[PDB]
Amino acid sequence: GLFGAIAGFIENGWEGMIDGWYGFRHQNSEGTGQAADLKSTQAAIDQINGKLNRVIEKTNEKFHQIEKEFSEVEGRIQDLEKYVEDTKIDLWSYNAELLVALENQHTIDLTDSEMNKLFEKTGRQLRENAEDMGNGCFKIYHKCDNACIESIRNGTYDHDVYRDEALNNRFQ
């Protein structure tokens, strides 16, 4: 995809994450753990629900039309009736093919985008107290107990608290 996260700098997905679409894995002093991010998960789902409801919007009701099967050979008039229907069907078949192609390219790009948005947001929270390893993982340069990890995940992490501790570990 256009952002290079999913199937890009993030090596693979997590079959283990069953409670969300995007999220966090950590290792700290207390062990390892996993948690889904709800906001990014919901942003993707809402956008996909949006396009689904646009696509499945019932928009044509037709009653008396032209005949489309014929028991007798007739020539000119029947040739035109068939050609009209065959022309229509081909155009609709093309629209359908293009629609899914565009929709699916975009769906992949927007999911890739949402992964990237979460990553950049996290990077910005951590300010100078962490570094991008380049594989979707931040090395945090300080003691980050489960309270501290959950602070990053639920958006309350104050970087000034750990800045001195972290800056020292980074450049020493």
Binding site: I6, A7, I10, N12, G13, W14, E15, M17, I18, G20, W21, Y22, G23, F24, R25, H26, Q27, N28, S29, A44, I48, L52, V55, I56, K58, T59, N60, E61, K62, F63, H64, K68, E85, I89, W92, S93, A96, E97, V100, A101, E103, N104, Q105, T107, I108, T111, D112, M115, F119, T122, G136, C137, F138, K139, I140, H142, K143, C144, I149, N169
Partner: protein
């Protein structure tokens, strides 16, 4: 010793392949089908008024073939013609059959209003053993076969004005005898003629004497014609022989009515969309069941499947086996 925080996304064991701008097949976590490719095989009886033609074409119900008498004055949103239908009255053709069938199908009704036409100096209510009605000879219920009275068939000249505020549809015909003997025996004159006119249009039909193939006891034929008379206009019928007269007119409507060829049984259910294969759901935007549809239907396309991705790219962890 500090800490690591990894960002990531889900994956699933069983993904689906979809098409994109760049890939004809690529794997996502989920997708949903946009093409309806199946039917129950049954036509739902709601919400459209379905009329099963059973043994009858719409045209035979219109004309009043006796085994189609049960269709008198019927109405429909969708008239369904069955492959088992048969004619069992006097043999006939309709020049522009397809148009008469279309306009009646679209009108959505066979409501017939009898009018007191005065046919001076001819015999009325002619019948044939080709068209039995009970034990004896009979005829199309809506047509009146006129033949000589005594030894004369005079010039028939009649009028029926339309002083209603709706259009009248008149169905009439012309008898084509097989022999000159038959022609003169029924109509006296050696060559008949039927002229049916309004202020704006006219139709003149000359009969044609000659054998056609034997159908239900007769080498003769009747040809069926129609004339619409608008409010303020007037019907005139002029003939010196071979007229198959109307007994009245059919009421015309405009609306959502149509006709479909299908052998699907009618069942008790609710479906907006009807195909000859049966009813289909309309939750999907496209369908591959049949290009013939009636109602609120997905649009017919050639593909039997199109998958809309409903999730991200599915990337399993590189496996060791």
């Amino acid at each position: 010793p500090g800490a690591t925080l990894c960002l990531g996304h889900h994956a699933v064991p069983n993904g689906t392949l979809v098409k994109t701008i760049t890939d004809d097949q690529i794997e996502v976590t989920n997708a949903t089908e946009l093409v309806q490719s199946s039917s129950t095989g049954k036509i739902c009886n709601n919400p459209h008024r379905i009329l099963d033609g059973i043994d009858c074409t719409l045209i035979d119900a219109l004309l009043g073939d006796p085994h189609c008498d049960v269709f008198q004055n019927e109405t429909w949103d969708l008239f369904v013609e069955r492959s088992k239908a048969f004619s069992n009255c006097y043999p006939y053709d309709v020049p522009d059959y397809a148009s008469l069938r279309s306009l009646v199908a679209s009108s959505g009704t066979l409501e017939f209003i009898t009018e007191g036409f005065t046919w001076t100096g001819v015999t009325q209510n002619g019948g044939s053993n080709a068209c039995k009605r009970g034990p004896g000879s009979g005829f199309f219920s809506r047509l009146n076969w006129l033949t000589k009275s005594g030894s004369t068939y005079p010039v028939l000249n009649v009028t029926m004005p339309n002083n209603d505020n709706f259009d009248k549809l008149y169905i009439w015909g012309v008898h084509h005898p097989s022999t000159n003997q038959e022609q003169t025996s029924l109509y006296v004159q050696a060559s008949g003629r039927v002229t049916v006119s309004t202020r704006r249009s006219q139709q003149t039909i000359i009969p044609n004497i000659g054998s056609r193939p034997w159908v239900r006891l007769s080498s003769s034929r009747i040809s069926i014609y129609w004339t619409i008379v608008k409010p303020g206009d007037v019907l005139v019928i002029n003939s010196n022989g071979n007229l198959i007269a109307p007994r009245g007119y059919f009421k015309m409507r405009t609306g959502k009515s149509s006709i479909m060829r299908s052998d699907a049984p009618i069942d008790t259910c609710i479906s907006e969309c009807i195909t000859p294969n049966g009813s289909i759901p309309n939750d999907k935007p496209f369908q591959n069941v049949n290009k013939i549809t009636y109602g609120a239907c997905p649009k017919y396309v050639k593909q039997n499947t199109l998958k809309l991705a409903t999730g991200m790219r599915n990337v399993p962890e590189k496996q060791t086996r």
